[PDB]
Amino acid sequence: TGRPEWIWLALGTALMGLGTLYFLVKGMGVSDPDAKKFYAITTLVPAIAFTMYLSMLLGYGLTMVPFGGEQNPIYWARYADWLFTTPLLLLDLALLVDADQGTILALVGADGIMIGTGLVGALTKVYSYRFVWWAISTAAMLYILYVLFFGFTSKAESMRPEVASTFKVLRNVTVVLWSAYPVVWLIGSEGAGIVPLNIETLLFMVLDVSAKVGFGLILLRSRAIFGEAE
Numbered sequence: 001t002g003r004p005e006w007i008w009l010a011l012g013t014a015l016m017g018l019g020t021l022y023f024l025v026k027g028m029g030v031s032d033p034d035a036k037k038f039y040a041i042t043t044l045v046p047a048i049a050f051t052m053y054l055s056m057l058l059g060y061g062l063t064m065v066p067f068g069g070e071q072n073p074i075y076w077a078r079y080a081d082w083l084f085t086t087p088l089l090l091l092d093l094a095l096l097v098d099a100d101q102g103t104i105l106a107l108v109g110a111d112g113i114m115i116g117t118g119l120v121g122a123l124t125k126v127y128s129y130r131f132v133w134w135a136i137s138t139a140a141m142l143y144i145l146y147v148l149f150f151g152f153t154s155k156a157e158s159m160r161p162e163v164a165s166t167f168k169v170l171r172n173v174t175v176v177l178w179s180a181y182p183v184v185w186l187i188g189s190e191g192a193g194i195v196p197l198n199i200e201t202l203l204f205m206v207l208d209v210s211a212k213v214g215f216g217l218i219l220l221r222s223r224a225i226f227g228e229a230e
């Protein structure tokens with residue numbers, strides 16, 4: 001409670017934990033193999049985020065990085081979370097549209113580059129270089145978003161209508177919420193430092209719960225996760 005952002009870390013921990021438990025109960029009894037994949041991916045996402053939020057709340061997922069002549073508090077646990085949860089979210093989208101394996105690997109690999117370069121930027125001690133890493137990570141994000149809007153055209157013709165509808169909604173949610181991340185980083189403690197760490201933590205908490213629990217609620221309530229069966 002010594003850090004003003006503790007309240008948002010505590011709320012994030014609670015919301016990710018509750019979301020995990022809800023998805024775990026909801027997926028109980030699901031037998032359809034396709035739906036099992038979506039429940040597994042979508043329950044793992046907030047479960048991982050729960051552990052990383054808790055690690056930030058308890059102080060383990062925080063480190064001090066010297067730059068700008070200050071000791072800057074950097075929550076590195078965010079990147080350990082996003083390293084696993086962001087490819088999993090992309091996998092949900094890719095499995096919805098029956099994406100080719102080449103496209104899945106492109107997405108997951110670009111996503112690993114996005115998170116890894118974000119982590120390097122977050123830990124870099126030369127201030128100006130932090131924004132070089134931010135730019136590379138943003139380029140990887142833009143590549144991901146490009147693939148989500150222009151890499152699935154060969155699947156549109158054979159796509160079930162409920163699949164197309166649910167995918168279109170999730171793609172819109174993804175573009176809006178994922179785009180906000182580089183902006184928060186750029187203006188917050190890890191970039192220019194014009195927004196204080198407590199407001200940055202609040203912003204990432206709203207984004208993360210929306211991108212994980214909100215996204216999951218939309219996906220797991222849709223008919224698109226079940227194979228077409230009589």
Ligand SMILES: CCCCCCCC/C=C\CCCCCCCC(=O)OC[C@H](O)CO
Nearest residue numbers: 102103105106109110113136139140143151
């Ligand atoms: C001057 C800098 C030049 C280098 C900047 C690289 C830094 C990372 C930036 C973007 C990641 C790009 C991810 C690359 C993954 C592409 C995979 C691919 O090409 O997949 C196509 C295939 O047809 C299946 O869709």
